[PDB]
Give the backbone structure.
Amino acid sequence: GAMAYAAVTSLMRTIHQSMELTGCDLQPFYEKLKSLRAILELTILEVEIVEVAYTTEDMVDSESRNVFLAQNLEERSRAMWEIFFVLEQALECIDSTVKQWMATSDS
Amino acid sequence: XXXXXXXXXXXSSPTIFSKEEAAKNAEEIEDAAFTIANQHXXXXXXXXXXXXXXXX
Protein backbone atom coordinates (compact mmCIF):
# COMPACT_ATOMS: atom_id res chain seq x y z
CA GLY A 1 0.00 0.00 0.00
CA ALA A 2 3.07 2.22 0.35
CA MET A 3 3.51 2.93 -3.36
CA ALA A 4 -0.14 3.81 -3.78
CA TYR A 5 -0.06 5.99 -0.66
CA ALA A 6 2.99 7.85 -1.97
CA ALA A 7 1.55 8.30 -5.46
CA VAL A 8 -1.85 9.53 -4.23
CA THR A 9 -0.08 11.90 -1.82
CA SER A 10 1.96 13.28 -4.69
CA LEU A 11 -1.22 13.71 -6.77
CA MET A 12 -2.89 15.59 -3.89
CA ARG A 13 0.13 17.90 -3.70
CA THR A 14 0.05 18.38 -7.49
CA ILE A 15 -3.63 19.26 -7.35
CA HIS A 16 -2.97 21.90 -4.70
CA GLN A 17 -0.11 23.36 -6.80
CA SER A 18 -2.51 23.55 -9.75
CA MET A 19 -5.07 25.26 -7.49
CA GLU A 20 -2.52 27.84 -6.38
CA LEU A 21 -1.56 28.57 -9.97
CA THR A 22 -4.92 28.40 -11.73
CA GLY A 23 -7.41 29.26 -9.00
CA CYS A 24 -9.52 26.31 -10.16
CA ASP A 25 -11.87 24.66 -7.70
CA LEU A 26 -10.12 21.32 -7.35
CA GLN A 27 -10.57 20.88 -3.59
CA PRO A 28 -13.35 18.27 -4.01
CA PHE A 29 -10.89 16.12 -5.98
CA TYR A 30 -8.31 16.67 -3.24
CA GLU A 31 -10.78 15.59 -0.52
CA LYS A 32 -11.94 12.53 -2.44
CA LEU A 33 -8.31 11.56 -2.98
CA LYS A 34 -7.39 12.06 0.66
CA SER A 35 -10.37 9.96 1.72
CA LEU A 36 -9.48 7.14 -0.68
CA ARG A 37 -5.89 7.26 0.54
CA ALA A 38 -7.20 7.03 4.09
CA ILE A 39 -9.00 3.89 3.01
CA LEU A 40 -5.81 2.36 1.61
CA GLU A 41 -3.83 2.91 4.82
CA LEU A 42 -3.13 -6.66 -4.87
CA THR A 43 0.35 -5.67 -6.04
CA ILE A 44 -1.21 -5.47 -9.50
CA LEU A 45 -3.82 -3.04 -8.17
CA GLU A 46 -1.04 -1.00 -6.56
CA VAL A 47 0.72 -0.83 -9.93
CA GLU A 48 -2.56 0.36 -11.44
CA ILE A 49 -3.01 3.13 -8.84
CA VAL A 50 0.63 4.22 -9.01
CA GLU A 51 0.82 4.58 -12.78
CA VAL A 52 -2.64 6.18 -13.03
CA ALA A 53 -1.76 8.73 -10.34
CA TYR A 54 1.63 9.64 -11.79
CA THR A 55 0.17 9.95 -15.33
CA THR A 56 -2.59 12.19 -14.01
CA GLU A 57 0.09 14.24 -12.28
CA ASP A 58 1.88 14.81 -15.56
CA MET A 59 -1.35 15.87 -17.28
CA VAL A 60 -2.43 18.28 -14.53
CA ASP A 61 1.06 19.82 -14.48
CA SER A 62 1.01 20.25 -18.27
CA GLU A 63 -2.48 21.71 -18.49
CA SER A 64 -1.82 24.05 -15.58
CA ARG A 65 1.19 25.26 -17.56
CA ASN A 66 -1.26 25.79 -20.43
CA VAL A 67 -3.41 27.91 -18.08
CA PHE A 68 -0.36 30.02 -17.22
CA LEU A 69 0.36 30.52 -20.91
CA ALA A 70 -3.28 31.32 -21.72
CA GLN A 71 -3.49 34.31 -24.05
CA ASN A 72 -7.29 34.35 -24.11
CA LEU A 73 -10.57 33.13 -22.65
CA GLU A 74 -10.83 30.11 -24.99
CA GLU A 75 -7.32 28.77 -24.31
CA ARG A 76 -7.88 29.28 -20.60
CA SER A 77 -11.21 27.47 -20.51
CA ARG A 78 -9.97 24.59 -22.65
CA ALA A 79 -7.04 24.08 -20.27
CA MET A 80 -9.22 24.27 -17.13
CA TRP A 81 -11.66 21.84 -18.71
CA GLU A 82 -8.81 19.50 -19.46
CA ILE A 83 -7.74 19.58 -15.79
CA PHE A 84 -11.28 18.84 -14.56
CA PHE A 85 -11.79 16.02 -17.04
CA VAL A 86 -8.49 14.31 -16.31
CA LEU A 87 -9.03 14.56 -12.56
CA GLU A 88 -12.51 13.03 -12.76
CA GLN A 89 -11.27 10.19 -15.02
CA ALA A 90 -8.39 9.56 -12.62
CA LEU A 91 -10.67 9.61 -9.58
CA GLU A 92 -13.06 7.14 -11.21
CA CYS A 93 -10.16 4.78 -11.89
CA ILE A 94 -8.65 5.10 -8.41
CA ASP A 95 -12.05 4.73 -6.73
CA SER A 96 -12.73 1.56 -8.71
CA THR A 97 -9.28 0.14 -7.95
CA VAL A 98 -9.55 0.92 -4.23
CA LYS A 99 -12.96 -0.77 -4.00
CA GLN A 100 -11.53 -3.83 -5.75
CA TRP A 101 -8.63 -3.53 -3.29
CA MET A 102 -11.14 -3.81 -0.44
CA ALA A 103 -12.83 -6.82 -2.02
CA THR A 104 -9.45 -8.53 -2.35
CA SER A 105 -8.64 -7.45 1.22
CA ASP A 106 -11.61 -9.56 2.31
CA SER A 107 -10.97 -12.63 0.10
CA UNK B 1 -14.85 25.68 -29.01
CA UNK B 2 -17.36 22.96 -28.18
CA UNK B 3 -16.44 21.38 -31.52
CA UNK B 4 -12.82 20.95 -30.41
CA UNK B 5 -13.84 19.19 -27.18
CA UNK B 6 -16.17 17.09 -29.32
CA UNK B 7 -13.14 16.07 -31.40
CA UNK B 8 -10.99 15.24 -28.36
CA UNK B 9 -13.85 13.15 -26.98
CA UNK B 10 -14.22 11.59 -30.43
CA UNK B 11 -10.62 10.45 -29.93
CA SER B 12 -14.20 -1.16 -25.70
CA SER B 13 -11.75 -0.77 -22.83
CA PRO B 14 -10.75 -2.23 -19.48
CA THR B 15 -7.52 -0.25 -19.59
CA ILE B 16 -8.69 3.26 -20.51
CA PHE B 17 -6.63 5.78 -18.53
CA SER B 18 -18.32 30.54 -15.28
CA LYS B 19 -15.99 28.14 -13.46
CA GLU B 20 -18.71 25.84 -12.12
CA GLU B 21 -20.18 25.54 -15.62
CA ALA B 22 -16.83 24.34 -16.99
CA ALA B 23 -16.16 21.97 -14.08
CA LYS B 24 -19.66 20.46 -14.18
CA ASN B 25 -19.61 20.16 -17.99
CA ALA B 26 -16.29 18.32 -17.82
CA GLU B 27 -17.48 16.01 -15.03
CA GLU B 28 -20.55 15.00 -17.04
CA ILE B 29 -18.81 14.27 -20.37
CA GLU B 30 -16.29 12.31 -18.30
CA ASP B 31 -18.91 10.10 -16.63
CA ALA B 32 -20.69 9.47 -19.95
CA ALA B 33 -17.53 8.58 -21.87
CA PHE B 34 -16.80 6.22 -18.98
CA THR B 35 -20.17 4.42 -19.07
CA ILE B 36 -19.83 3.89 -22.83
CA ALA B 37 -16.26 2.60 -22.50
CA ASN B 38 -17.44 0.50 -19.53
CA GLN B 39 -19.79 -1.42 -21.84
CA HIS B 40 -16.69 -3.61 -22.42
CA UNK B 41 -17.23 8.55 -32.43
CA UNK B 42 -20.32 6.58 -31.42
CA UNK B 43 -22.27 8.73 -28.94
CA UNK B 44 -19.26 11.07 -28.84
CA UNK B 45 -20.85 14.29 -30.11
CA UNK B 46 -24.02 13.00 -28.47
CA UNK B 47 -22.19 13.20 -25.13
CA UNK B 48 -21.18 16.87 -25.45
CA UNK B 49 -24.80 17.92 -25.99
CA UNK B 50 -26.30 16.63 -22.74
CA UNK B 51 -23.15 17.75 -20.93
CA UNK B 52 -23.51 21.23 -22.45
CA UNK B 53 -27.23 21.09 -21.67
CA UNK B 54 -26.70 19.97 -18.06
CA UNK B 55 -24.19 22.67 -17.08
CA UNK B 56 -25.57 25.76 -18.86
